[PDB]
Amino acid sequence: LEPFYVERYSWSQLKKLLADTRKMAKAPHDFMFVKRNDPDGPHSDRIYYLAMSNRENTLFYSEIPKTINRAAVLMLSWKPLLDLFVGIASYDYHQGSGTFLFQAGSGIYHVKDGGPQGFTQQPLRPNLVETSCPNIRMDPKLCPADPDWIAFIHSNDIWISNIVTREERRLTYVHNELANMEEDARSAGVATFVLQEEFDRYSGYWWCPKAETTPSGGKILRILYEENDESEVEIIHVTDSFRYPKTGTANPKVTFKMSEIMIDAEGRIIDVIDKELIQPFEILFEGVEYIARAGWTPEGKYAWSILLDRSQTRLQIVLISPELFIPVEDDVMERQRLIESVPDSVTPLIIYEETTDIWINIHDIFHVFPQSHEEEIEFIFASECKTGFRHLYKITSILKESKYKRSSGGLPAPSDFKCPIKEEIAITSGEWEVLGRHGSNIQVDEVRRLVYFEGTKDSPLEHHLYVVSYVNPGEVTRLTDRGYSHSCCISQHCDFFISKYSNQKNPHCVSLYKLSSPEDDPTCKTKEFWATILDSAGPLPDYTPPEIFSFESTTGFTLYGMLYKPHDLQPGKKYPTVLFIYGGPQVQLVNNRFKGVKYFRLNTLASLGYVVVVIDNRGSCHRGLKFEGAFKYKMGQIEIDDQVEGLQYLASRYDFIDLDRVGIHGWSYGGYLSLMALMQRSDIFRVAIAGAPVTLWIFYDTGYTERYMGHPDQNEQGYYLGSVAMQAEKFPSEPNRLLLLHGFLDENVHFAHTSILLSFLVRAGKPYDLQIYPQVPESGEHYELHLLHYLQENLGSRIAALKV
Amino acid sequence: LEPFYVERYSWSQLKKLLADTRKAKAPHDFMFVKRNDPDGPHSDRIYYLAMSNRENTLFYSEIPKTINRAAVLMLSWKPLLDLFQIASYDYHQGSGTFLFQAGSGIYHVKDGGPQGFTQQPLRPNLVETSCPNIRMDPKLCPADPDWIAFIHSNDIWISNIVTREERRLTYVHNELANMEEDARSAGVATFVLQEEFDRYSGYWWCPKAETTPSGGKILRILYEENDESEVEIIHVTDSFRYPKTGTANPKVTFKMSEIMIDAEGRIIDVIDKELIQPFEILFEGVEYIARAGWTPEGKYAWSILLDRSQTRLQIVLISPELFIPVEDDVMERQRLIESVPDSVTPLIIYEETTDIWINIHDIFHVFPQSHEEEIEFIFASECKTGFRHLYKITSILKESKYKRSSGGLPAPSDFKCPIKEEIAITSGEWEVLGRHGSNIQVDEVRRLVYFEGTKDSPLEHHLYVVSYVNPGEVTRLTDRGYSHSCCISQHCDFFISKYSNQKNPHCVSLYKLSSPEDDPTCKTKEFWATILDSAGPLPDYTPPEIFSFESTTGFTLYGMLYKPHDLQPGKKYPTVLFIYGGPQVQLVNNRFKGVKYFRLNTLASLGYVVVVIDNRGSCHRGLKFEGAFKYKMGQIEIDDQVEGLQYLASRYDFIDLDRVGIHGWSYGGYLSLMALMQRSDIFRVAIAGAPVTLWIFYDTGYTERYMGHPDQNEQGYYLGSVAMQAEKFPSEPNRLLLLHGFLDENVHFAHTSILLSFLVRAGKPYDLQIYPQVPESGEHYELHLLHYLQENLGSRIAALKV
Ligand SMILES: *C(=O)C1(C(=O)Nc2cccc(CN3CCN(Cc4ccc(Br)cc4)CC3)c2)CCOCC1
Numbered sequence A: 001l002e003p004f005y006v007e008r009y010s011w012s013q014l015k016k017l018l019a020d021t022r023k024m025a026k027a028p029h030d031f032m033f034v035k036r037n038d039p040d041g042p043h044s045d046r047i048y049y050l051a052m053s054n055r056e057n058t059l060f061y062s063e064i065p066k067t068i069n070r071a072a073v074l075m076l077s078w079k080p081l082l083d084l085f086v087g088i089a090s091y092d093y094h095q096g097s098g099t100f101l102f103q104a105g106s107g108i109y110h111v112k113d114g115g116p117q118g119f120t121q122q123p124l125r126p127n128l129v130e131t132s133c134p135n136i137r138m139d140p141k142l143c144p145a146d147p148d149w150i151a152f153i154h155s156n157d158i159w160i161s162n163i164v165t166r167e168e169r170r171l172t173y174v175h176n177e178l179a180n181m182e183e184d185a186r187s188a189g190v191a192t193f194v195l196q197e198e199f200d201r202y203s204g205y206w207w208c209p210k211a212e213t214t215p216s217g218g219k220i221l222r223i224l225y226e227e228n229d230e231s232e233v234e235i236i237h238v239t240d241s242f243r244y245p246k247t248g249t250a251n252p253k254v255t256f257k258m259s260e261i262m263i264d265a266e267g268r269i270i271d272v273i274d275k276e277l278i279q280p281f282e283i284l285f286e287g288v289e290y291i292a293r294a295g296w297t298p299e300g301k302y303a304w305s306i307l308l309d310r311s312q313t314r315l316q317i318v319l320i321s322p323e324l325f326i327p328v329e330d331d332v333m334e335r336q337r338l339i340e341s342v343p344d345s346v347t348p349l350i351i352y353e354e355t356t357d358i359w360i361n362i363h364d365i366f367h368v369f370p371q372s373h374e375e376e377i378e379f380i381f382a383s384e385c386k387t388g389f390r391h392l393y394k395i396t397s398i399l400k401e402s403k404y405k406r407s408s409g410g411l412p413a414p415s416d417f418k419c420p421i422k423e424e425i426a427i428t429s430g431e432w433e434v435l436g437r438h439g440s441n442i443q444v445d446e447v448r449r450l451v452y453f454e455g456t457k458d459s460p461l462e463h464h465l466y467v468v469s470y471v472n473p474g475e476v477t478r479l480t481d482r483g484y485s486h487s488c489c490i491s492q493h494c495d496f497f498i499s500k501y502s503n504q505k506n507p508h509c510v511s512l513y514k515l516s517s518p519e520d521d522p523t524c525k526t527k528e529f530w531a532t533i534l535d536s537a538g539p540l541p542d543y544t545p546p547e548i549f550s551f552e553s554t555t556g557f558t559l560y561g562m563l564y565k566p567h568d569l570q571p572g573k574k575y576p577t578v579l580f581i582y583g584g585p586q587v588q589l590v591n592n593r594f595k596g597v598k599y600f601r602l603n604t605l606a607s608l609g610y611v612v613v614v615i616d617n618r619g620s621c622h623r624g625l626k627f628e629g630a631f632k633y634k635m636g637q638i639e640i641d642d643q644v645e646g647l648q649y650l651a652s653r654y655d656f657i658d659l660d661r662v663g664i665h666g667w668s669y670g671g672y673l674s675l676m677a678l679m680q681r682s683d684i685f686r687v688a689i690a691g692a693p694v695t696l697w698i699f700y701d702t703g704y705t706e707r708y709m710g711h712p713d714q715n716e717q718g719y720y721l722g723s724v725a726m727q728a729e730k731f732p733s734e735p736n737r738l739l740l741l742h743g744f745l746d747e748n749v750h751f752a753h754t755s756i757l758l759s760f761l762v763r764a765g766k767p768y769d770l771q772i773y774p775q776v777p778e779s780g781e782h783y784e785l786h787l788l789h790y791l792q793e794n795l796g797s798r799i800a801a802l803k804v
Numbered sequence B: 001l002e003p004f005y006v007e008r009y010s011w012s013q014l015k016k017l018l019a020d021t022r023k024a025k026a027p028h029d030f031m032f033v034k035r036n037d038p039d040g041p042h043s044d045r046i047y048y049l050a051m052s053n054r055e056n057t058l059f060y061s062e063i064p065k066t067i068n069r070a071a072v073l074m075l076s077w078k079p080l081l082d083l084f085q086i087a088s089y090d091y092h093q094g095s096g097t098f099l100f101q102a103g104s105g106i107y108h109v110k111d112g113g114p115q116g117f118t119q120q121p122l123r124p125n126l127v128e129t130s131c132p133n134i135r136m137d138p139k140l141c142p143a144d145p146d147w148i149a150f151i152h153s154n155d156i157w158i159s160n161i162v163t164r165e166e167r168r169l170t171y172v173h174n175e176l177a178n179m180e181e182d183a184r185s186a187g188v189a190t191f192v193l194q195e196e197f198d199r200y201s202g203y204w205w206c207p208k209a210e211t212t213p214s215g216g217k218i219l220r221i222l223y224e225e226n227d228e229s230e231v232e233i234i235h236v237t238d239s240f241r242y243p244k245t246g247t248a249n250p251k252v253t254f255k256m257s258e259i260m261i262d263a264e265g266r267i268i269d270v271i272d273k274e275l276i277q278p279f280e281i282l283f284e285g286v287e288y289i290a291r292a293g294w295t296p297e298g299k300y301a302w303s304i305l306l307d308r309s310q311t312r313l314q315i316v317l318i319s320p321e322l323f324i325p326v327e328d329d330v331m332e333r334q335r336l337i338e339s340v341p342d343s344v345t346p347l348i349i350y351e352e353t354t355d356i357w358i359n360i361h362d363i364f365h366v367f368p369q370s371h372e373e374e375i376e377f378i379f380a381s382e383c384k385t386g387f388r389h390l391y392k393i394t395s396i397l398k399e400s401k402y403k404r405s406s407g408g409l410p411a412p413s414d415f416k417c418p419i420k421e422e423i424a425i426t427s428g429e430w431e432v433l434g435r436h437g438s439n440i441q442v443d444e445v446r447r448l449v450y451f452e453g454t455k456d457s458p459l460e461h462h463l464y465v466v467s468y469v470n471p472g473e474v475t476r477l478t479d480r481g482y483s484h485s486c487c488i489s490q491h492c493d494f495f496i497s498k499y500s501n502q503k504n505p506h507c508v509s510l511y512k513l514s515s516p517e518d519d520p521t522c523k524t525k526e527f528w529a530t531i532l533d534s535a536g537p538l539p540d541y542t543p544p545e546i547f548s549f550e551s552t553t554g555f556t557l558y559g560m561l562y563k564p565h566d567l568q569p570g571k572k573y574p575t576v577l578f579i580y581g582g583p584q585v586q587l588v589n590n591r592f593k594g595v596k597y598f599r600l601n602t603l604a605s606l607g608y609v610v611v612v613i614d615n616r617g618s619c620h621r622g623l624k625f626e627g628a629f630k631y632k633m634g635q636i637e638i639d640d641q642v643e644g645l646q647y648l649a650s651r652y653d654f655i656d657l658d659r660v661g662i663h664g665w666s667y668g669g670y671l672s673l674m675a676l677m678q679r680s681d682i683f684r685v686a687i688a689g690a691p692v693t694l695w696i697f698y699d700t701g702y703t704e705r706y707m708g709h710p711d712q713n714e715q716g717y718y719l720g721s722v723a724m725q726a727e728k729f730p731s732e733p734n735r736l737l738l739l740h741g742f743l744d745e746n747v748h749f750a751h752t753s754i755l756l757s758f759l760v761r762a763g764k765p766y767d768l769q770i771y772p773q774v775p776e777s778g779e780h781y782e783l784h785l786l787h788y789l790q791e792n793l794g795s796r797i798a799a800l801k802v
């Protein structure tokens, strides 16, 4: 078997090759369906959505016709909703009023469409909400109970503002803008760094969906909101500064407040009353580090929250009555009578609790039914805690008065607020997961008593949409077609769904499907294609898709991989191999989706003469908790076995794979594994290129690290064995084998990781290559040029093998 | 001619080679104290600082009245201090008090005063404090050695070492405050003055106490007070005030603490005094306080003041009568301003200009005042002939035409003093040295001045003496064949020389000075004793050859040549040019290069020709030679380097002109980048360590001296800033390697960072090594550099690789 040698391009030639082959718009999303209710007209529904038509991500609408010509294919045209001469990330809407609300740059704007006002046939001028606030307003939201009222965040404080009356009032005085960050670490209504980065919770305030009428003929509006104290939280610097909770250090001090807003009959503010918890957060919610999720019951009787312990191994869904909140009062005497005024019946309610020896994966599935009985609550939730696969469970929990009495002056026991479980029915089950993250949610038809959900049942390589009864769960009907991964949205009216779908051969597509029922059984569901929203571009002419492969592993699981065969393959000749790797939690690289946009350059590599290989090792997602839990406390210790195992699977089954000439490359967790690879399996991997790698888990945040690696105090040996900075001595003593790439201003994986590795590589007298991108298209081009040139001169080419 | 290829070693082999080949401060800050004991054997005790891996500390040696002139006396080092349960020191002849900082503490001891001479180590006595933070820059009051001053959290404090009384004199800085919020300091020299003018202290004791009626006294401290509020701020892995070229330097003034002491040495009172008119009014156009002190009797403070362009120097006398108590009360203040007579004016005793630049030095000697309207002093200047010579000046202290009471502002020449006389003491195509320890010692009895100079050669420093009265015969006291660094005893009967040459490691020796009985002004020297024996020629080290070549520019240029060891006939070798090439430095001279530049030898042992050349701009060749790159930094240095390379090559067939690398640090890293950028044909690889890449990112004091304000020099700043010219770099990799420390506070990493941005944006390849924070860093550097040169310049694979 002869070794193949890649063309040795000059730097100038490689640059040109890359510029020619290079020669990604946000596909429509945030769909909403509004009925036309016009019997004489041709359209059942208008859909609104966000999309890029190098453009503003903006609002569009399309017309859903009552009938189609089933001989032809209908392509909906995109009608601009706004009169435009930055972007719109998200929008808010109120059905009764037809009020849209959204941020675009510095301005909060609003418009009406689809309400009592009727339906525009032309773009609307966005109406700016006037403000006196110096700085940018963030995270605006319509009050669902009065669309004249919005809320927003200015300088880490909650404000409300009336789009009719022009009235603007600050609700919280927790922070002053002209201040030092060491001086002021307090914020209200804003989710802190760890909750954004590690739990994907972006908002920290929640309009109560219902009014309460005042006897005068006015009303009370309400805002549940998280208030955070970051005083005790590590501060770090980047070429400004922010509060980063390093693993094993302090997370922010947290609590629930409730802003109660009295409005008169003319819609002017009478008074604002900031309320606090009757007993400090730490008493009422023992053991709870993070507020993962919060909102309200549909009628606003209770607020709810999903609460986690620091070790993220215990989850509690808790009901919080507005009555548990008493005004913020200076005088002890006056304050003392308020606490007596609160009855002992008004206690917190833990409607659900679960635990695992692995970890809770937080998700966006939680549906509450209307309350049929004061003493009960009925809800759908998803959990891996029963079977080790995320499944939907319909639960009834009893709102028993607690044993604990505040009047007595004692402290509450652990299980004092636990609620009995009347009913806990599994709606789904199997060796596959319900998806509850990154847009994946459920839709509940309360009339037909059905629930639409996305899942891995047909294959862990493809997402499909499914329906099932939550009343007598059995048959799970798949609604999307096989041979594609789907990302779906269901109309609130549950008579339509939209799928964004693709596969390795074909670019993403967006289609609309009409849902029907046979007249004899409403619970049974069929789908018919209705219209295209976004036509697939079509197979890329210059792009050759990889083949998906699998192999039963010695670890007892199937492992899936992608193999990019060298273009123009020669017989008898063995080729140099590049392993591209992520291999960390919460991510799957290997699935039936178009990889031609993001991983187009794995194709470019194949074109130069490299075998390219990707493998989802254990710890990767869409394979259930047991498969994910394999590296718990042992990050870095197993992933490279699985990668090597798969590489030897392929090498015995194909002989164009030259095992003497394997390179590995990855960003973030991949950068980490690329370093671990050269360190542990020096005999397999000739070169390792580490992009922005984790090199020292003690330099990484609480929410992520402690979930997978525990508190460092109780896992020094795992933290040590998983930290490449601490094991510098194990790298090769010959150069041209280790390449480090890092953004200087990285705020997720600090440059700190790369510098601390560099000081330890120097102490250990080890060689290294480094590249830095100090601030942007120009950086990307330099990366790809440097990567291809490094692989050529140090792996692929003639001169590379001479160099040893 | 068949090309030599260096043995291709592995990383682990090279690391081992460096480690095998790898297998302490010389006596300094000397002082001579007379024994004054007729029956005893010794004339003098000498105190000095030295290490014998060890703490730098105080030692003394015994100078014998006589020696056996057949033998060689090695002085033995007696430790003066007892180990505690030192970088500098102060001394007070009359009392024999030593004062010095050792770690966090200020200690003191007595030797050689009335209390006599110890025969054993003394126990350092701690100066007790209530101050939370570390005390800096302790100094004895020359008027009363019970009192010291020191700096604490950027304010001046005093402390009596007998009474233990402690008092803060200035209230300018709040320690517990944001560094951006509080930017005032007192008695402390700011970044640019330490870093670009080597002034380290910001306050000066008046050397005399004025007696009061009560039997008490008044002690005086002149101090600088700085406001750094408008100065740019930069942050490193805290933050500090860095004046970027063309931006604001600190706001500066003179202040004076009057300290009333009673007859038992208790502080009665402390009065803070400010200039009667602001600094900007009294000293028009002055930006920098370069130097300051007192006249020997304490009648005047003195100062050497520079303009922003560093082309005007003034020496100014400042009477204490010029300061008034700080009074926020308008009525009181006006009354105080009226009470100070118009006859009391700053006296500019000297003023000079140049179209090149002023070079600040440490030479300034004031003679005892013999008349009230005359001051007699010795200064040094390049401004008359373009070489630094000593001038004896007498200036007339007339009453000024400006009268404060007329409510006007003074005109630019109102404070200028007539020059009664200006006499050259030295002259010639050579310079008096006045920096890095070089100064004069004036003998006021025999009317002679000892000084250091390049008179005999630009490659050797020598000690010289000459009369300052009928200047003529300059006598060389040090011996030819060595570069010397010297200190003269205050009694002027001895001198010490730390000397070396290319072949021999540094040595320190004591010489006795004598006069023939018939002429005290004639001076001879006799060897007396060795203070530190030379290690002897290094066994493993092979000294380079000093060469020179007559440049087309019309100057002799000097270089050093390391011939490749075990030289083969008919074979040509790869050449490493090592470079600094910048102002204020000379790499090529007759000194031992076996410590600092030992690795240039290692290179030659591996089969590399090594070249070093002092291009124009380098020092010790006078102001005209230095002035070559005025406004044009980066545009001429590499021509000289290449001229000397081409010269060596057309004389030696063993230089492979097709395989030249260049390497340096700082200015040398700059020129290494400039080299590959302008002379791509000559240089295969540039290794740039801590390069300046953007002249607007460097400081005021240095950059504006050599390049002026950026507005006056758009083209020089552009052409001299390599980061502005990233597109002129090679498109082929393994030619450019950058080395930087992330924490550099002189050449910020920012220079490397901005360069990388433009290299990326221009699609250019580069290599990078970083030292994040320590002897392990140096070893890795040496290891990466030798291996890099092997792989990419001098080995067989290197030739193949192209
Ligand atoms: C890690 O999580 C994180 C990071 O991912 N950083 C990062 C930096 C730079 C680029 C990317 C995107 N990535 C997309 C896939 N490409 C594959 C590839 C391209 C080109 C070639 Br020639 C081969 C393979 C690589 C680049 C991601 C993000 C969070 O913060 C820390 C850094």
Ligand SMILES: *C(=O)C1(C(=O)Nc2cccc(CN3CCN(Cc4ccc(Br)cc4)CC3)c2)CCOCC1
Pocket: B578, B596, B597, B599, B600, B665, B666, B667, B689, B690, B744, B746, B747, B781, B782, B785, B786
């Ligand atoms: C520039 O002025 C400055 C600087 O000099 N930095 C610096 C950093 C690290 C080391 C040195 C010491 N330098 C001594 C001379 N060596 C000669 C040599 C050694 C080894 C080999 Br293999 C060849 C030649 C080189 C290193 C100096 C200091 C001021 O601030 C900016 C950085």
